[PDB]
């Protein structure tokens, strides 16, 4: 069954990532005794890879090498590195090993779409109707991988990495049975600057756009903070005997999953929310939701009420994370010359998830380290300065959109 092939590819593509993505901070901190700086600069590598590797590898997919074979090469490298990473004991090595893995992994995020699109389109189907049910298994792979590694007792354990590599290899084997995905050669007459998304640098001529993009970087910096240290913040409550055995202490990935759960459901309510309140309002709902998220983490407790607040934060996360990115790219498209409109979202997403990522990763790790003393982190204060930077972002955005 073709559909089933694509669904296994989606599942695996994301299972291998979820097995370690959210927990790796904790494993660096609780087990490897890493400070916040080293962790934040290890998760920064995602951004370094993301800013330019997707572009170039999609380029080669389009001109010299089947997307199938390029995807294969990537996850192979992903697998080898994930294995080595479970044998890495120092931060510089963790950063270098993760950086390679991301340089290989980041491009696959579009390569699987290239592949799934052609697979359905060369088979009398339209993506708008038959892709969403194939893209829900990538979300299942992710949330279940979180569930599994949590429940197997491998959260704080280097095992998560062995499992991710194991999925990556299983993956590579599965993508060998793929059918020949031709070199699309759609980009051919495309100017050399057009392919890398270099037009949109000129687009900084528009003062309003320039303002928007740097805002998008500043806002994007806090996008993954919860995903980088939320599991470490929930494991922080080891230090009390009362919370030691608490389920949300024991299995943080299980509580954090509600974050991904709510992101999926809220991505579903994005179109309607746009129709009812507009681009700028939906982006504002995102910026305000980040405040609430970090505020609820700041008073979160394994206690009954503290857990209530913690779960509330999870729910708020989904709107917070989905809304800004969807309404942002819609805003950019609506606001720019149609000819260059796509380079707009190229540069928007690059600024927001690459540069936003590098800057956020590094700075937040440093905030943690600055408020980590004797090996114990004052999470309440950490989350307050993050909720307060959310507030500054709210204020400045209110200025721009009144």
UniProtKB/Swiss-Prot annotation:
Superkingdom of this protein's organism: Bacteria
Task: Give Gene Ontology CC terms.
Answer: plasma membrane
Q: What is its main location?
A: membrane
Spell out the molecular function terms from Gene Ontology.
cytidine transmembrane transporter activity; nucleoside:proton symporter activity; pyrimidine nucleoside transmembrane transporter activity; uridine transmembrane transporter activity
Activity regulation here? Answer: Inhibited by the protonophore uncouplers 2,4-dinitrophenol and carbonyl cyanide m-chlorophenylhydrazone (CCCP), and by valinomycin. Inhibited by the nucleoside antibiotic showdomycin.
What result follows from mutating residue 263 to A? Answer: Abolishes the binding affinity for uridine
For the Periplasmic compartment, the record's topological domain ranges are 29-35, 88-90, 156-157, 236-246, 300-304, 369-378
Cytoplasmic topological domain ranges are 1-3, 58-66, 113-134, 178-208, 268-279, 326-345
Q: Record's Pfam families? A: Nuc_H_symport (PF03825)
Cellular compartments annotated: Cell inner membrane
GO-annotated biological processes: adenosine transport; nucleoside transmembrane transport; purine nucleoside transmembrane transport; pyrimidine nucleoside transport; uridine transmembrane transport
Keyword vocabulary terms for this entry: Cell inner membrane, Cell membrane, Membrane, Symport, Transmembrane, Transmembrane helix, Transport
Please give the start and end residues of each transmembrane region.
Answer: 4-28, 36-57, 67-87, 91-112, 135-155, 158-177, 209-235, 247-267, 280-299, 305-325, 346-368, 379-402
Q: What else is known?
A: Binding of nucleosides to NupG requires the presence of hydroxyl groups at each of the C-3' and C-5' positions of ribose.
Protein name per Swiss-Prot or TrEMBL: Nucleoside permease NupG
Report the source organism. Answer: Escherichia coli (strain K12)
Query: What gene does the UniProt entry assign to this protein?
Result: nupG
């Amino acid at each position: 069954n073709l559909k089933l092939q694509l669904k296994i590819l989606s599942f695996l593509q994301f299972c291998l990532w979820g097995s370690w993505l959210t927990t790796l901070g904790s494993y660096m901190f609780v087990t490897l005794k890493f400070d916040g700086a080293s962790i934040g600069a290890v998760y920064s590598s995602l951004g370094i890879a993301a800013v330019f590797m997707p572009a170039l590898l999609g380029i080669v997919a389009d001109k010299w090498l089947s997307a199938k074979w390029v995807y294969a090469i990537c996850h192979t490298i992903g697998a080898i590195t994930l294995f080595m990473a479970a044998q890495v004991t120092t931060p510089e090595a963790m950063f270098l090993v993760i950086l390679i893995n991301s340089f290989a992994y980041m491009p696959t995020l579009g390569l699987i779409n290239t592949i799934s699109y052609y697979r359905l389109q060369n088979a009398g189907m339209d993506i708008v109707t038959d892709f969403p049910p194939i893209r829900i298994w990538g979300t299942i792979g992710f949330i279940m991988a979180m569930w599994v590694v949590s429940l197997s007792g491998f959260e704080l354990s280097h095992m998560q990495l062995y499992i991710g590599a194991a999925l990556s290899a299983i993956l590579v084997l599965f993508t060998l049975t793929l059918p020949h995905i031709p070199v699309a050669k759609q980009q051919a007459n495309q100017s050399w600057t057009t392919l890398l998304g270099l037009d949109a640098f000129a687009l900084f001529k528009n003062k309003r756009m320039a303002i928007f993009f740097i805002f998008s970087m500043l806002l994007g910096a806090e996008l993954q903070i919860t995903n980088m240290f939320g599991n470490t913040f929930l494991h922080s409550f080891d230090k009390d005997p009362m919370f030691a055995s608490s389920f949300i202490v024991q299995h943080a990935s299980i509580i954090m999953s509600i974050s991904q759960i709510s992101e999926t459901l809220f991505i579903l309510t994005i179109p309607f929310f746009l129709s009812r309140y507009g681009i700028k309002n939906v982006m504002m709902i995102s910026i305000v939701a980040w405040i609430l998220r970090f505020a609820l983490f700041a008073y979160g407790d394994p206690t009954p009420f503290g857990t209530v607040l913690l779960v509330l934060s999870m729910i708020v996360y989904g709107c917070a994370f989905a809304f800004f990115n969807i309404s942002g790219s819609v805003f950019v498209e609506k606001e720019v010359s149609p000819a260059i409109r796509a380079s707009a979202q190229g540069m928007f997403l690059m600024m927001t998830n690459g540069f936003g990522c590098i800057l956020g990763g590094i700075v937040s790790g440093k905030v943690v380290e600055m408020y980590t003393q004797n090996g114990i982190t004052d999470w309440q204060t950490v989350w307050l300065i993050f909720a307060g930077y959310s507030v500054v972002l709210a204020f400045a955005f209110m200025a721009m959109f009144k």
